[PDB]
Symmetry: D2
Subunit: 46 residues, 4 copies
Amino acid sequence: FQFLRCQQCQAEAKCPKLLPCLHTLCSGCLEASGMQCPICQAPWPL
Amino acid sequence: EFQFLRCQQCQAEAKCPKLLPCLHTLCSGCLEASGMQCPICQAPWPL
Amino acid sequence: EFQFLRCQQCQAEAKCPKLLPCLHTLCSGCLEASGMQCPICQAPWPL
Amino acid sequence: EFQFLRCQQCQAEAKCPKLLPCLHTLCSGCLEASGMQCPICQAPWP
Ligand SMILES: [Zn+2]
Ligand SMILES: [Zn+2]
Ligand SMILES: [Zn+2]
Ligand SMILES: [Zn+2]
Ligand SMILES: [Zn+2]
Ligand SMILES: [Zn+2]
Ligand SMILES: [Zn+2]
Ligand SMILES: [Zn+2]
């Protein structure tokens, strides 16, 4: 079996985090996202 | 033999859910009441 | 204006998709034609 | 900050879930024990 795919850039997303919007992101896109999802702009908590 | 999806905000049936920018499933009532954003994750509705 | 979901088998509109055991989204036509298993992943339908 | 996904069979953590033909999320333990098909929906493994 392969890993999940990032729904922003379609690279492999090995161990994706649980996000509030349920999107799947690779580490690169998540670290680059700032304060909200790059796909739907759901704000990240804190 | 199969039932409909469930609303992730109120847990009722969501028979014909709309495609939202986030991946959530909402019944029509919860969508109509939501204002400018998803009531679960606050993804803004597209303008 | 929100749109309806898309069938993952034929990519037509799936306005009121049923909840399947595998979580795929199918239009009513593709579900009616499916026989006893999912046309995408072959998850068996209950019975 | 963010937590990881949950296994949909046992509800434990699934840190790095594999892509299955069905859309289910399994921890590695539940996947290793599954045999030739998904333990939730019985979609056959390729
Ligand atoms: Zn990515
Ligand atoms: Zn998102
Ligand atoms: Zn609702
Ligand atoms: Zn949402
Ligand atoms: Zn179809
Ligand atoms: Zn399926
Ligand atoms: Zn498990
Ligand atoms: Zn499954």
